[PDB]
């Protein structure tokens, strides 16, 4: 089975800059059998390059494909706003299965921004349901990588939280993230301190936001 690797994992660049994307194969490929695709979330993949270096009709010539053997490159000569997307190389034939590489995401570069962190207790209304949701909001930060830890009366929580992250903001190029801790009402009422500890490179040290159950 062919294995494809893509580097960088992510690229962070400004509109107007050149992008160089790497695709390496575990065994040599015919140039006829290496393709590149663009993908944006929720939209069909788009063929950029086939046969290592050929553009299908309609593809702008700022997209250039090169390479041979085990080493392939997709160049974007000058990034346009629409080019911030995920790019996949693909072993496109002539046998099967056809393999997509792991992808390189090209993000909009901006300065590092620490998250503003907010914590929300469950509403009294929800507690009537028998379940308590505690929400931790990490707002307007960059880059996307962030760590959230939950502690309840200083016990680290495991398996009872879920995270969601926004796409890069159109105006300020930041991300936001939510982490939601789910507890039974019974467990929520048995404990006092609810803490969300956040680690991000914009912070000199991790930040903890907390509340005590029952306090205004």
């Amino acid at each position: 089975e062919i294995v494809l690797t893509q580097s960088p994992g992510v690229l962070s660049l400004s509109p107007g800059e050149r992008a160089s994307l790497s695709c390496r194969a575990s065994h040599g490929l015919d140039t006829s059998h290496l393709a590149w695709f663009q993908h944006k979330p929720g939209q069909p993949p788009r063929l950029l390059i086939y046969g290592t270096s050929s553009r299908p009709p309609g593809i702008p010539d700022r997209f250039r494909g090169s390479g041979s053997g085990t080493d392939f490159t997709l160049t974007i000569t000058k990034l346009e706003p629409e080019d911030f997307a995920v790019y996949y190389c693909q072993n496109s034939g002539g046998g099967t299965p056809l393999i997509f590489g792991p992808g390189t995401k090209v993000n909009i570069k901006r300065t590092v921004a620490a998250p503003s962190v907010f914590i929300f207790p469950p509403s009294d209304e929800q507690l009537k349901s028998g379940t308590a949701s505690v929400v931790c909001l990490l707002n307007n930060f960059y880059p996307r990588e962030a760590k959230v830890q939950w502690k309840v009366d200083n016990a680290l929580q495991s398996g009872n939280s879920q995270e969601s992250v926004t796409e890069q903001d159109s105006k300020d190029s930041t991300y936001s993230l939510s982490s939601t801790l789910t507890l039974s009402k019974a467990d929520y009422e048995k404990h006092k301190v609810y803490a969300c500890e956040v680690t991000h490179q914009g912070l000199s040290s991790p930040v903890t936001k907390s509340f005590n159950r029952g306090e205004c």
Partner: protein, 232 residues
């Protein structure tokens, strides 16, 4: 008007079967193979198989789904199909068809090339035991634990609905600055949940009303939830 048009999205029970169609328009159907590809939440695209349209119509399948997938074409109706049986939760994904010369024909100026150049719009298949259910919308109230000096955060927790999607606005669309509506998560219960938040000036909490407008068309549920500061 070269295009591939797929059938609509479907919710299916675990163990059921589903057939997705892919109708070809605007080109000579027998001149291109058809592939099926899917992309599941949080994963990259996965090739599932191809149909040898124009070369006898046999299918080749990827090993992961082999034994419970069937792919066929109908030359007369220029349509291709994928049928996936014994559906599991892990089959929840968007399914795409694509056309491809796949090295079969001598395209003038391009040769016996390989390249999936035209794609269908996608078909979302949700595999779930859940019944249609509207959300319970809870306030994420602004407090001191959600205030950054002159800024406060507030929101709505839109919990326990099925299937996707909900839409959320604030103050009937009049409030857009600082709004973040998060992608939904699938809970262990099988129901979806999301939050929508907004940052506003702390000083505005006593004078400006904040209402999240939530619409869940699948269950004919509409919610307009007022979010007010914590009672002190």
């Amino acid at each position: 008007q070269v295009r591939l048009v797929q059938s609509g999205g479907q919710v299916k029970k675990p163990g059921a079967s589903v057939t997705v169609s892919c109708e070809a328009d605007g080109y000579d159907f027998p001149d291109y193979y058809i592939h099926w590809v899917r992309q599941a939440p949080g994963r990259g695209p996965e090739w599932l198989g191809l149909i040898k349209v124009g070369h006898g119509g046999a299918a080749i399948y990827a090993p992961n789904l082999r034994g419970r997938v069937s792919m066929t074409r109908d030359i007369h109706t220029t349509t291709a199909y994928m049928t996936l049986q014994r559906l599991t939760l892990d089959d929840t994904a968007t399914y795409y068809c694509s056309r491809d010369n796949f090295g079969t024909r001598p395209v003038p100026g391009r040769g016996y090339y390989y390249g999936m150049d035209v794609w269908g719009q996608g078909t979302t298949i949700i595999v779930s035991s859940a019944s249609t259910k509207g959300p319970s919308v809870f306030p994420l109230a602004p407090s001191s634990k959600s205030t950054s000096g002159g800024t406060a955060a507030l929101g709505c927790l839109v919990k326990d609905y099925f299937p996707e999607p909900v839409t959320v606005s604030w103050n009937s669309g009049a409030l857009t600055s600082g709004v973040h509506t998060f992608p939904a998560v699938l809970q262990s219960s099988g129901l979806y949940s999301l939050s929508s938040v907004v940052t506003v000036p702390s000083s505005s909490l006593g004078t400006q009303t904040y209402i999240c407008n939530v619409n869940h068309k699948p269950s004919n549920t509409k919610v307009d939830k007022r979010v007010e500061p914590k009672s002190c």
